[PDB]
């Protein structure tokens, strides 16, 4: 029994984040616990302040007609408990639930460890014999405690795109809103745990540039190649199969090449010291000691620039 | 109380994908969040436009008789919320739910990293004292947002096999429809992370072909054999126990052989340089440097052709 | 209100497998999605064909008394949706649900990779002031689609043990039936991924039998000992702690011994070449080259025979 | 509406285990599927055998007042289905549910691989305006099928502590019972998979006691040190963070020491063979060959005794 | 229908922990099973002791108006079963549920293995046409059995912050309470399993300080570098991405440096013994044997002090 109206019914939405948690990079989902605020005029139940009762009249969800508000990018149905319905005299309804869903928003791993994201929450509504349109009441969308967590992320801003997008979908029109959570990843733990360790082993790798033993150099350059695969895997692990290239996926793959041409050198600095041409060998080896570090630091500037600086 | 009819009742189905996610290769399942659209004529409730009420009459699921529509290849019962029932004057019902199930469709790993799939969703319906037949209303089966995700997959086309397959099952007939989601895997991340790394270590492996030290060559050829097992496992891991051979499972197993005959060589190039017949040794070793790379690149063309090219 | 009867009430059961999936070897459980078919005479509601209504009368589960049928070896309560109740005029009820449980049936890992299983589904029923007995109606127990999956297994046959076993349990008798799913494991992927790789590394292991360098032989025999522990673990991992010995657990443990006496040899072939008795050393080493491979191939025939051939 | 009584109401409990499974060592929980049997006299509904109906009267849970029986050491609320309520003429109620919970009972890892456990299930009941007391009816507590599983454990005995413990808790008294499941771990798979393999690698470790090559001995003693860390981790993995010392945690940590002083030796047997004092070197090394094995086998007897023999 | 009042309604809360478990460090959540005790005066149902019935009157949740009490830092809605409602003559209600939630409280990993935590449980309440305020009745908040578990933690004290914090939230005021569980981590298992093992391998690392073989020293210093990465990973694994530095994260990262400058030394002690300047080499190496251990033990005191001692 929807509220009889002369035009499009405005439902006035507002989300207040109470808890954020479980941002699953692999899954590309997070979990929210918030307030939903709906409000619309159903004049059909305005109620004579003085004539009876009190200032405001309280209802159970069954009584009133409530607008069916669905979240769009959600796995299962939004899990909600009604907190209060309060009809104002003029026929204004104030609805308030507390829901918990896990939302499905895509992330952009392009700058992986140093990346910021904008999460989305949608809210559609479908029409019947009247149209409905959603819209934000900003006093109820200050959504966010001074307690919102989200481990390993810094929360920048919860806001809402005030103009809804109104599709037609299956011979009935729908009204969609875009709530936006802007977060930036807490890169750091990545330094002492991946980045720094990753470099160290690469440096040790080409400690083999001041050595003449094949046996000790294959042991060197190869044993580190392994440890890098370990790191390579450790990372490719907490991360989805993007169809593009991640920043660390680059520098991680680049690094693979320095292990190759290092191995290529050590190997050459040998079919050229067993050929009694050590003239040339100790010549190559010596250049390496400069070329490798320099080309690296260069490729990183090049690489780095190509990702962030553009 | 099913709608009394002179013949077979046509229910008119249509799915509109809203969300796709969690394609579990190991499990052989995905998870969908869509619209179900059913529509049938239950003349038994045609309703005098002018004589009363309005253009269309709204119902709750309890009132009307609704057809029991089950998904076939689903784990548990399809998890649904009713969005609207709308009876037309002539007795035409327009049903619309939003469901979320996880579907069980087999995948074909034969071309693994470079594979396309066709996922299925079924929908049966069983009969009573009248027969039911399902069929697609294509205006409602344009199922798919311009937002459908499915991480690590490219979505080609959501369509429906318009002719139902009508079994008899346990002295009552059923009507089944085949909805079809066609996806192709986003191979790529596999290059910088598996394929390329895998090759590199193999090349390094037979760097030992320009060396004379057993100690450094077993260190070489063997340390890489290990890293390959690492890769072998990392892969066999995100992949089910198919009874056939995968493409990468081939080239991965092939590679095992090159580590064997490499080890076989290095070993022979030694019980043949400790036998003062270095005449022959440096002869073998030299050939290897060509045979290995050539046989490989050959076996890959052979192998590759055998999978895709046929 | 159970159907008043002159003797034991026969409920007529039948399962029709629609989906099979998630056979968890570690857990010792699988997951089924089937039809349950119950049928009994409750004369207490026979209904005058001509006198009123139609051929068959449809009921909701509340109306009728339905027999409480429980699955025995199930984790939680069987998860079911009623599909139809249809009373025949003579008072014959035709019940049909579609359920989904995860069943708990023990597996026999004795021949692990090459093993067949017989899964069980039970169904009890308890009595009240009348006795109940279950029994199979084979037309409804043809349970199994031509689509039943069960990844990594071949499905042989779904049948039912027609004679129920009737316990007394807590001063009331129960009737139990045994539905039986016979599957055989799809060994194969195990070859290119475990068995073959496992052997290769063992062969390489005793490549050290045609070598004289300790340094290169400990590197050899020991580096492969590691890779075997890797395989050992990869396997002991997807497998429960059986109190008996698995087939692969045997050949995997046997293999451990060849790494020991190999290491034992290389070691001896040295405190016996540093003792200027190379007379004996190169004598031992040479025998090994035959003894190891022969004893192995022998122990496998012995072992193999002991498991399958008996 | 609780049964009016002249004193403390005795509810007569009894559990009959139907399924046991999922003993999670890490979590310290198992999962049971049993029968709960309650029985009490509610004279307030005695019922004239002859005067009406039959021998026993059947009820639905709503009618009667049933005692609220909670499990104490349970994660969530016990998950139950009522199987029968049967009132006897004298006003004796026979209740019977089938429940499934996962229980939280602490385990004692002190003898880890060779340990026995006593699991607990509790059952409280709280009072109102009458007191309740629980107690075991042993005919209904023979709880246990000849089918109870519990993979990797041997089930010794299901019994109940007949005297309840009656607390006061928050100005009302409660009655608690202790059901006890006594199981002993199936050590064995631990031998061919951890223990034996663990030892072998340790032996190989000090194969380095009959060798003179540093390069081959560091390769030896160190490569095995690694494999042990692998085992160390594989174990510390399926096991909780106990605040005491486990048996294998000991012998595993002990073993760490033999790798240290082995490494200490090999190292010393070198700054003492490069010092032209091989007099002493080959003297130490030779003693080791006896000291290590003997001290080990001794420390194990000492250790072993300290855990089991006391 | 809320209790008509002349001022702010006091609801009197109290939690009694029955079970604690599953403190997930990664997730930053634990799981509780407790009693909730609410009590308020609803004079609107005072009831004439003598005039009728008995001392206290029992209700079902539907009858009475009950205050809606929500947990704040909870994932989903608190999962509860009502245990008793008991109205006193004066109109005093005694409510008692048993709930189970999983709570979301932040942990402080700063001293990781040696850290104490204070977990939180919140409880809000929202107002309507009267205000509500929560407060602790300490006789009901002695919350905690002498059985509360929480594996791997020592439970210090369950108490409650008696003064509620009263926000205004969306034009209605709320009353929040802070229940506090104080636990300290059971460090120990960390010694025999991480700390001790970690050190040992570091010591062995610089056993290479009493050696002259590059081949054996790269084998040494590098093979341990690997094992440390293993440990590094094993730890970074059961631990969240904090934006600060953990204590073990420090000493773990510190240790990375000793492997670098160790590798730096061994390498230098060689381009300086192949340069016929062994004068200097054996000079460096000798200092190391003191500098390394001393700088370490120093850096640890420095580090340690910086974390705990401040």
Swiss-Prot record, chains A, B, C, D, E:
- Keywords (A to Z) from UniProt: Cell inner membrane, Cell membrane, Ion channel, Ion transport, Ligand-gated ion channel, Membrane, Potassium, Potassium channel, Potassium transport, Receptor, Signal, Sodium, Sodium channel, Sodium transport, Transmembrane, Transmembrane helix, Transport
- Report TM segments: 187-209, 213-237, 246-274, 278-310
- What are the annotated GO cellular component locations? plasma membrane
The protein's job, in short, is: Cationic channel with similar permeabilities for Na(+) and K(+), that is activated by an increase of the proton concentration on the extracellular side. Displays no permeability for chloride ions. Shows slow kinetics of activation, no desensitization and a single channel conductance of 8 pS. Might contribute to adaptation to external pH change.
What the record says about family reads: Belongs to the ligand-gated ion channel (TC 1.A.9) family.
Q: What else is known?
A: The homologous nature of GLIC to eukaryotic nicotinic acetylcholine receptors and other eukaryotic pentameric ligand-gated ion channels, and its sensitivity to general anesthetics, define GLIC as a structural and functional model of signal transduction in the nervous system, also relevant for exploring the molecular basis of anesthetic action.
| Protein's UniProt name | Proton-gated ion channel
- Lineage per the UniProt record: Bacteria, Bacillati, Cyanobacteriota, Cyanophyceae, Gloeobacterales
Q: Which gene encodes it?
A: glvI
């Amino acid at each position: 029994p929807p509220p009889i109206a002369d035009e499009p019914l405005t439902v006035n939405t507002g989300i207040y984040l109470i808890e954020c948690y479980s941002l699953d990079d692999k899954a590309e989902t997070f979990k929210v616990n918030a307030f939903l605020s709906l409000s619309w005029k159903d004049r059909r139940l305005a109620f004579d302040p003085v004539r009876s009762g009190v200032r405001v009249k309280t209802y159970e969800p069954e009584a009133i007609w409530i607008p069916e508000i669905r979240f769009v990018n959600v796995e299962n149905a939004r899990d909600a408990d009604v907190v209060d319905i309060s009809v104002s005299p003029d026929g204004t309804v104030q609805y308030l639930e507390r829901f918990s869903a896990r939302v499905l928003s895509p992330l952009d791993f392009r700058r992986y460890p140093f990346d910021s994201q904008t999460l989305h929450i949608y809210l559609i509504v479908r029409s019947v014999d009247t149209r409905n349109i959603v819209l934000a009441v900003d006093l109820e969308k200050v959504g966010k405690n001074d307690d919102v967590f989200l481990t390993g992320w810094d929360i920048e801003s919860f806001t809402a795109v005030v103009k809804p997008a109104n599709f037609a979908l299956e011979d009935r029109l729908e009204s969609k809103l875009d709530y936006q959570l802007r977060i930036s990843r807490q890169y750091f733990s990545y330094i002492p745990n991946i980045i720094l360790p990753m470099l160290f082993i690469l440096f040790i790798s080409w400690t083999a540039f001041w050595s003449t033993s094949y046996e000790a150099n294959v042991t060197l350059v190869v044993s580190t190649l392994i440890a890098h695969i370990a790191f390579n895997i450790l990372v490719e692990t907490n991360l989805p199969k993007t169809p593009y290239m991640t920043y660390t996926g680059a520098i991680i793959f680049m690094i693979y090449l320095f292990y190759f041409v290092a191995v290529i050198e050590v190997t050459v600095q040998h079919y050229l010291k067993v050929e009694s041409q050590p003239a040339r060998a100790a010549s190559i080896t010596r250049a390496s000691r400069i070329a490798f570090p320099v080309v690296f630091l260069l490729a990183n500037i090049i690489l780095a620039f190509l990702f962030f600086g553009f």
